[PDB]
Amino acid sequence: RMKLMIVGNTGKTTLLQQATVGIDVKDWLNVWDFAGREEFYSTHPHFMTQRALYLAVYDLKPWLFNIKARASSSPVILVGTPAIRDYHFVEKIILSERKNVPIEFPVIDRKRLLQNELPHAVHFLNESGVLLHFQDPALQLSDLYFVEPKWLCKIMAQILTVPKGIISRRDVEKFYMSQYFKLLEKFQIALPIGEEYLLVPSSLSDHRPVIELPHCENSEIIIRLYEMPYFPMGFWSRLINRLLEISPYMLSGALRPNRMYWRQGIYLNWSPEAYCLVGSEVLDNHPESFLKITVPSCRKGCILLGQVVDHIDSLMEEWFPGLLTLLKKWALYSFNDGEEHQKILLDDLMKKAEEGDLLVNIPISQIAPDLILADLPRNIMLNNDELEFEQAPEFLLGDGSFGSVYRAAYEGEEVAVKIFNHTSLRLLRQELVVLCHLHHPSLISLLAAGIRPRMLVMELASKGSLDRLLQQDKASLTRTLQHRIALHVADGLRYLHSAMIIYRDLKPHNVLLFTLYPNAAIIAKIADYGIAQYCCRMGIKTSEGTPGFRAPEVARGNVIYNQQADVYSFGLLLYDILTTGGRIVEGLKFPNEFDELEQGKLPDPVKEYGCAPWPMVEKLIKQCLKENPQERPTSAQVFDILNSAELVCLTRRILLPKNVIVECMVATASIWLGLSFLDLNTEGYCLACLYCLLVGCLSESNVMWGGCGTKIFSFIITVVVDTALYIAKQNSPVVEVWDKKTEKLCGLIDCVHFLREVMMSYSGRVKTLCLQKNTALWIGTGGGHILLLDLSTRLIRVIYNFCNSVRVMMTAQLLKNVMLVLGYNQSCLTVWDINLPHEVQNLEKHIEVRKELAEKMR
Ligand SMILES: C[C@@H]1CN(c2cc(-c3n[nH]c4ccc(OC5(C)CC5)cc34)ncn2)C[C@H](C)O1
Numbered sequence: 001r002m003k004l005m006i007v008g009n010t011g012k013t014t015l016l017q018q019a020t021v022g023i024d025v026k027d028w029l030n031v032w033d034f035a036g037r038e039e040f041y042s043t044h045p046h047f048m049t050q051r052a053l054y055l056a057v058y059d060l061k062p063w064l065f066n067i068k069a070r071a072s073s074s075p076v077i078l079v080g081t082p083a084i085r086d087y088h089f090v091e092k093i094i095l096s097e098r099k100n101v102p103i104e105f106p107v108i109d110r111k112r113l114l115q116n117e118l119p120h121a122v123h124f125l126n127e128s129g130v131l132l133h134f135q136d137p138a139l140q141l142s143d144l145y146f147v148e149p150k151w152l153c154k155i156m157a158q159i160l161t162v163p164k165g166i167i168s169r170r171d172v173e174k175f176y177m178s179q180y181f182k183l184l185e186k187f188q189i190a191l192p193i194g195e196e197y198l199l200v201p202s203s204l205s206d207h208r209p210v211i212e213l214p215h216c217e218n219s220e221i222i223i224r225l226y227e228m229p230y231f232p233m234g235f236w237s238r239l240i241n242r243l244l245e246i247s248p249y250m251l252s253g254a255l256r257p258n259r260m261y262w263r264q265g266i267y268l269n270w271s272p273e274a275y276c277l278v279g280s281e282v283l284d285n286h287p288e289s290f291l292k293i294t295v296p297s298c299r300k301g302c303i304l305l306g307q308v309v310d311h312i313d314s315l316m317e318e319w320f321p322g323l324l325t326l327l328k329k330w331a332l333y334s335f336n337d338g339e340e341h342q343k344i345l346l347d348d349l350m351k352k353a354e355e356g357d358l359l360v361n362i363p364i365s366q367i368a369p370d371l372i373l374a375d376l377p378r379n380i381m382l383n384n385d386e387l388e389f390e391q392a393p394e395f396l397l398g399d400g401s402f403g404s405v406y407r408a409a410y411e412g413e414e415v416a417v418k419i420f421n422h423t424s425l426r427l428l429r430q431e432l433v434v435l436c437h438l439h440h441p442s443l444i445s446l447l448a449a450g451i452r453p454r455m456l457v458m459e460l461a462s463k464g465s466l467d468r469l470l471q472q473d474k475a476s477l478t479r480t481l482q483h484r485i486a487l488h489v490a491d492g493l494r495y496l497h498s499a500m501i502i503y504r505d506l507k508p509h510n511v512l513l514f515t516l517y518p519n520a521a522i523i524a525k526i527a528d529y530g531i532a533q534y535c536c537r538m539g540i541k542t543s544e545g546t547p548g549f550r551a552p553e554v555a556r557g558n559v560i561y562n563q564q565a566d567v568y569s570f571g572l573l574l575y576d577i578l579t580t581g582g583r584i585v586e587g588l589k590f591p592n593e594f595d596e597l598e599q600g601k602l603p604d605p606v607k608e609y610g611c612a613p614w615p616m617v618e619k620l621i622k623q624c625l626k627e628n629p630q631e632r633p634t635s636a637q638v639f640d641i642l643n644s645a646e647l648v649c650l651t652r653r654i655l656l657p658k659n660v661i662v663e664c665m666v667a668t669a670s671i672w673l674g675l676s677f678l679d680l681n682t683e684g685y686c687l688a689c690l691y692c693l694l695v696g697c698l699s700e701s702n703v704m705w706g707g708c709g710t711k712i713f714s715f716i717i718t719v720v721v722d723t724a725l726y727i728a729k730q731n732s733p734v735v736e737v738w739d740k741k742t743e744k745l746c747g748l749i750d751c752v753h754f755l756r757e758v759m760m761s762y763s764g765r766v767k768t769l770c771l772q773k774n775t776a777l778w779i780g781t782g783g784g785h786i787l788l789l790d791l792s793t794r795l796i797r798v799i800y801n802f803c804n805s806v807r808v809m810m811t812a813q814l815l816k817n818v819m820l821v822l823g824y825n826q827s828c829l830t831v832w833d834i835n836l837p838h839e840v841q842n843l844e845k846h847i848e849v850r851k852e853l854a855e856k857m858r
């Protein structure tokens, strides 16, 4: 029905009559008596929900922060010993089925065996105390339906009750098991640090050690204060997890530092000149909570001051809204390095840093080097004299999330300048996370970054954005170019996702084209990091993205999502690339319905927009547009699917009816079958041994050859004629080569060896051959394997995973030559682009050239 929650410090269980290790539940009203110990605080922000009445026992506060974070409106009642209301002191059928849970551990994978209903019915039940289905994409545990929620609350913090605060996995195991270790980390209870050790941020040492960190003088350290009224519920578990997962990449961007933990604070040190002491502080006569950050006042010690500050500021934008103001940032400074530090508000010091980088009664570059961006590389600092920038509508390029890209020229080159409109330094520095520290041939390159006008200077895309290409010039979107656009964008996502960064808005407007030459090394780049954020391991919570270009789990802001939200965005981008304008053009002509169908009721691309069919990409779109984010392939797999020449050159995959078993076929665009008929345009369901009219193995290249029995005649399955003589017999895994001039065997070709090199499945029995003028030979093996071999050097690629046994191979004229192949599986009439042997080499060279470029930039 409706559930009640009793929250408060140690001083609850006794009050429940009308030592609490857990959130034990004794329903009458459904009570959720919490734990007052400070050790359990980090794990149960999650269990506070909207449909609950809150009771507080202060006895004779961080609790209300998350009370007014999951739901602003809540009937909070206070008793003794921001919605205060008292100071007295002292889907219905599934509920019955879910009540009975006769299992060992109360977890059920799916309700189908036990039993738009499910997904919504469970949420209402989840809002009650019947069961806990977290179903958040980040947690990756939506397949677990936790019945008897009192079990989950009880045995999930038993690790912290059974040096001071580190526990190994084996000790927990020595006390259906891998899911337990996932629950521990995903609730910020026991996060891994080593291969066999769990940190357990809670229940660490209560008091910090005695640290004699090398630099003690005022002129050798930089101190940053983060005064708060109180530490938000489970703040340090979030911060410690964030700081030990970025530690190897905090100076270089992989140097593992020496780390210390005391449950409020962390000490990272790479050297006596490169350390960082993030830790809580307690000032006398101050009822506040501080967060001191001490770093050395050197070049290598300023770099990771702006790293820690960026990772703490971001950690409150996505995880602790409300502190942003309750939280005020100070900056300790002292003129003579013998006196006591003095503090100035970081906002007040930002005003003095906008007009001259000096502070008068010492430079600002040592008080707070991150407001003047003095910690980012010295080569990306704006020289305002060499900037010819106008800010006129005639020079407007695009409108970014928070700025407006204008055209300008910097250092003589013609570049693009972004002006932040009303904004803060955080927006400039949040986008600076990706522009520097990450270099890739598929990410826009930053040339300079100013602070006085607060602009970014990116390189200029020669040919504009992809959105204009789709909507204006549709004639230049060749099939070999719009594949490279998707390949380059998928490579950009792969680097961003591998670098802890979720991009959030991937749309054609943010895809920049530097050339329309299909064979160039760099064609597409992704720009605009306005909403890119760190997705550390805990996912992201805040929801951003343009409607119609975002994942379904992003439109609904209640869940916390992960980097898989960009794969769905990529699936829509590749959906638009395949359909050119298509949905986007209709989207601007139908507002508030562009995101209505994303849901995800996207129609078939060929059926509606009438594009040229592209198999293995329509399949890729279908498996990227998955409602379940776990079913979507990762960005490292989307690139791997796109990085294949069989995907590019596969044109038609007509599927014949069941058990038709066609054995002969001839071309004419329509294809004949045998007697049947098939039209390529509408896909509507020996011939002209025979030759077109010799009647039988006949080929010519006017010299004509033939084959009968086990001998070759001129005036055994197939006869292939070239400068040499290629022929194979029935059930012959080897193809022999002959010479017309000598009438003698000149070597043999064995397909089994080629198949053996690639890691009775592999038939290898030759069933047909076909030759192409590009010194490449097509061999049809007994399985679903196709061998491409040079005619001169005598392997290109082995084509597989499209049928079960290739029957007949031939070349036809579609205005494009195609190598249409018929094979059994059910039988299918596969059609391949004749340039497949070339595209295997061109794409192989293209990846290697870009691979060298990626190492070159870093
Ligand atoms: C057609 C015209 C348009 N053009 C461009 C350039 C750009 C561009 N370049 N560099 C950028 C860096 C960032 C950037 O942030 C976006 C994606 C937020 C707009 C855009 C550009 N974006 C559109 N159009 C270049 C000229 C030659 O051609």
Ligand SMILES: Nc1nc2c(ncn2[C@@H]2O[C@H](COP(=O)(O)OP(=O)(O)O)[C@@H](O)[C@H]2O)c(=O)[nH]1
Pocket (backbone or CB within 6 Å): 009, 010, 011, 012, 013, 014, 019, 020, 021, 034, 035, 036, 037, 081, 090
């Ligand atoms: N004298 C007195 N003691 C109380 C009162 N209410 C609770 N207590 C004491 O508080 C203890 C209950 O602790 P409790 O809040 O349940 O611990 P927690 O659930 O772990 O936070 C009992 O042992 C009582 O002795 C009261 O009104 N008067």
